[PDB]
Every structure is written in structure tokens, then in C-alpha cells.
């Protein structure tokens, strides 16, 4: 029993958009569908709820005239969409499987996450941070910015197999996002041995690599 | 509708240790749900109908309670347990989630790694300057950071940003960046990054100088 959902959306404010949940390996007509919406995060907001067998519908009254359940049952399929679309709306959509009468919701999708802004798609910029103090290790870094919309992915290539990498989430400023990420590697392994950072943008289809190097 | 107050907000315990978390209905409801929700993941049910555990939770974990109290509890917390717990009610419609339980490990206080980067002569040439603080591997969570130029202190045009707590040594993490331009750090020369954590009164400082 597995549902999965349509990957990320951007879209500018007042269009619409169409989430899709693709129900498998149980009777889709037998189980309500449950949609849920997580704002950046934090609290859990229930949106409405869907009867795939016959159809019928229960919103909440805070989305009434913002979100619309369909279904397909040719294909297994819920379906919700988001009209005049905010950056309010910006969030997670989660489809949950309404296990039933004291059952709770059995199951989720991966979730899909929606953006609502101007800011056109843009690849980043990839700078290293290498050392210009000498101690026992020694910690690198790669700074990504510039970058719409999230997420990006940074993987470390050294010649050692052990990496205190930290990823640090992203943060908003100048309407484009910005990214660190570290490692903490041997003294002894760099910069004796390659280390690179490999910056992943899919939304612009980019990925930056960056060997670092001394000062 | 029928609002769920969750308590307490955040909370922190270690290996071994006994945890309860509490779950208050505005007004009287019958049951509740709880899910486990990791940092990047989906929620997951883990608790059902109060006291009904699903497949594959350990037997750590136990609910109950009735009318408006409500409480989830775990008889030995593991590393493995490490998130964040909403309690859910389906009494009235709409049905309500709480704000969430975010339920971290305790562990022993730790120093920050600190470590400074200058701006890259790459990102010099493109019109810009980003100087680099990475705060790393300390415990709590609570922190300061200030940056100096030669002495002078600097607020805003910083931005900092924390990691979750890290899964292997349980510690956590921050960055900071104070972002210029090219000629606003062509002025100066000294530029000192300055961190002041629970563990010691003396802060832990790293610079560097242009030259
Ligand atoms: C007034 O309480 C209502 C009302 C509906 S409704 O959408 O059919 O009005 C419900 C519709 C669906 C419910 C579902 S499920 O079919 O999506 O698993 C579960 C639950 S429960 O909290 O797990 O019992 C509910 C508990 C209470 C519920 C409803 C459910």
C-alpha cells in the first residue's frame, strides 16, 4: 500500500495547479482520500476529504473555494486543485489514505511541495570556502546562492571515508535563496586529496562542482 | 471547531529515559491519533485510536487517556525516536491537528567547532564578498554570534542558519554569513567572527586578516 504524488511546482500568484495522488496495492475505491497541507513546516492544516467510490466531498470551510477534490477511478487516482494561488498557499500537500472509523490516516504520501512567487528560475552560484590556525582537522565548505526555487543537493567527494558533513538549510534573502554546507575531514587527508562539492540545482537542470583548494 | 493543545512544545531526553507527552481537547472527544514525522519525511501513523499501536512501532510506545486529556508515552527513549509527534482528533468536523511534540535527544554539552572563511577571490571578481562562520557540532542548541571589524561591531547584513539535531552524535550545528559587497570589504582589514555558547563564558573567536 503506497501513494505517490506529483513532484514540486512552481507557479506564479492567481494561476492554479492540480496535485495528483496515485493509490496502489489496495481496493482505491474502498478507502477515503485525505488531504492535508504543512505551511514551512510547522502545524498540520486539513484540507478535505473524498469519497473514491461515490464521489462525494467534505471540505473544510477554511478551503472551501480554494481547493477542489476529483478522483479517478479509472485510474486509481485523487486528485486536488488549488486555485488564486498566494504565497500563503506555499507549502507541503500531503494525500493521506483514511484508513477508517477509528483508524486514523494509514497512510501518506511523499508529499509535494508548491511554490507561489514572482522569482523567475535561476541556477546557483557555487563559492568555496577553504582555510587562509593549524589543529587537528580541519573543516571546508561550499556556499550556494542565488538559487530559485529550493531545494538543492550538495555531496562531498574526498579521499577519506570519514565526513562530518552539516547541510544548513536554506535561507531567503534578496528573493533568492542561499545554501552552506560543510565538512570536517583529517588534517592528514587534505589538501593531500582531492575535495569536491557537488552542488545538484534540478529545478534549472545544473549541477556545479567545486574542488577545493588551499590559500 | 475543536482546537488540540499540545504539551510541551519541545522537549529533550536521554537514552533509557521515560517520556510522556500530553495531548488537551478544547472540549471532550472520545480517541486521537498520533503521528511520527522525521525531518525531509512524510507522517507516518503511529498511535491509533489511543491506545491501538500500528505495525512495525516498537512496544516502547503507549497511548492513552480519554475525554480531553490525552497522552502519548515512551518506557526507554532511543536515538530512534528522535521527532516530532501531532496528535490528531476527528470528533467535529473539521478534524484538528496540535502544534506538535518536537521530541530531541539529550546528550552532553559540547563546544562549537568554529571555523572562518573569507570571501573567495571567485565571488570577489563577481561583484561581491561573503565572509563564512561555520558553528559546528555543539550542544544545546542555544546560541549567539556577533561579527567585529577591526573591533567595531557589526548587526544585520548577517544571516544565520541552524541544522536539525545531527542523527550520528546528536549535536547540532549553525552558519553564519555576513554578505557585502566588494568594495564595503575592500575598506577594512580585520574581520572577526565571535561565538558565546552555554558551555564557557569566554567566547570562542576566529579571524583572519585580507593580507
Ligand atoms: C464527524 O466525524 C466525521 C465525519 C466524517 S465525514 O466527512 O463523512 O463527515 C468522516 C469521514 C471520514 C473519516 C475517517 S476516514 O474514512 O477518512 O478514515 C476516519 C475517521 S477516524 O478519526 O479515523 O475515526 C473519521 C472520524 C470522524 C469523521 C470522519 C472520519
Known amino acids: 500500500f503506497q501513494l505517490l504524488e506529483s513532484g514540486p511546482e512552481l507557479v506564479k500568484p492567481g494561476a492554479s495547479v492540480k496535485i495528483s495522488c496515485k493509490a496502489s496495492?489496495?481496493?482505491?475505491?474502498?478507502?477515503?482520500m485525505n488531504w492535508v497541507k504543512q505551511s514551512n513546516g510547522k502545524s498540520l492544516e486539513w484540507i478535505g476529504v473524498?469519497?473514491?467510490?461515490?464521489?462525494?466531498?467534505n471540505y473544510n470551510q477554511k478551503f472551501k473555494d480554494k481547493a477542489t477534490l476529483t478522483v479517478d477511478q479509472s485510474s486509481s487516482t485523487a486528485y486536488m486543485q488549488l486555485n488564486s494561488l498566494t504565497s500563503e498557499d506555499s507549502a507541503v500537500y500531503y494525500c493521506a489514505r483514511g484508513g477508517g472509523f477509528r483508524r486514523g490516516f494509514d497512510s501518506w504520501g511523499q508529499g509535494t511541495t508548491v511554490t507561489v512567487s514572482s522569482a523567475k528560475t535561476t541556477p546557483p552560484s557555487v563559492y568555496p570556502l577553504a582555510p587562509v590556525a593549524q589543529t587537528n582537522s580541519v573543516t571546508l565548505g561550499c556556499l550556494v546562492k542565488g538559487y530559485f526555487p529550493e531545494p538543492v543537493t550538495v555531496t562531498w567527494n574526498s579521499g577519506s571515508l570519514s565526513s562530518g558533513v552539516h547541510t544548513f538549510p536554506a535561507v531567503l534573502q534578496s528573493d533568492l535563496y542561499t545554501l552552506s554546507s560543510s565538512v570536517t575531514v583529517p588534517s592528514s587527508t587534505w589538501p593531500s586529496q582531492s575535495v569536491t562539492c557537488n552542488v545538484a540545482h534540478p529545478a534549472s537542470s545544473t549541477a556545479v562542482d567545486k574542488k577545493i583548494e588551499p590559500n | 471547531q475543536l482546537v488540540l493543545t499540545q504539551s510541551p512544545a519541545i522537549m529533550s531526553a536521554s537514552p533509557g529515559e521515560k517520556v510522556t507527552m500530553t495531548c488537551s481537547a478544547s472540549?471532550?472527544?472520545?480517541?486521537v491519533h498520533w503521528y511520527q514525522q522525521k525531518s525531509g519525511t512524510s507522517p507516518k501513523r503511529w498511535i491509533y485510536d489511543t491506545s491501538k499501536l500500528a505495525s512495525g512501532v516498537p512496544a516502547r510506545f503507549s497511548g492513552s487517556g480519554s475525554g480531553t486529556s490525552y497522552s502519548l508515552t515512551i518506557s526507554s527513549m532511543e536515538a530512534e525516536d528522535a521527532a516530532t509527534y501531532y496528535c490528531h482528533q476527528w470528533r467535529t468536523n473539521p478534524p484538528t491537528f496540535g502544534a506538535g511534540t518536537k521530541l530531541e535527544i539529550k546528550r552532553a554539552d559540547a563546544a562549537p567547532t568554529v571555523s572562518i572563511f573569507p570571501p573567495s577571490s571567485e565571488q570577489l571578481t563577481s561583484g561581491g564578498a561573503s565572509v563564512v562562520c561555520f558553528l559546528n557540532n555543539f550542544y544545546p542548541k542555544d546560541i549567539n554570534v556577533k561579527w567585529k571589524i577591526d573591533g567595531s561591531e557589526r548587526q544585520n547584513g548577517v544571516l544565520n542558519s541552524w541544522t536539525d539535531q545531527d542523527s550520528k552524535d546528536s549535536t547540532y550545528s549553525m552558519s553564519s554569513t555576513l554578505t557585502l559587497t566588494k568594495d564595503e570589504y575592500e575598506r577594512h582589514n580585520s574581520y572577526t567572527c565571535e561565538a558565546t555558547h552555554k558551555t564557557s563564558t569566554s567566547p570562542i573567536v576566529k579571524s583572519f586578516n585580507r593580507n
Open positions: 496495492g489496495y481496493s482505491f475505491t474502498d478507502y477515503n
Open positions: 472540549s471532550s472527544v472520545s480517541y
Open positions: 473524498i469519497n473514491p467510490n461515490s464521489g462525494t466531498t
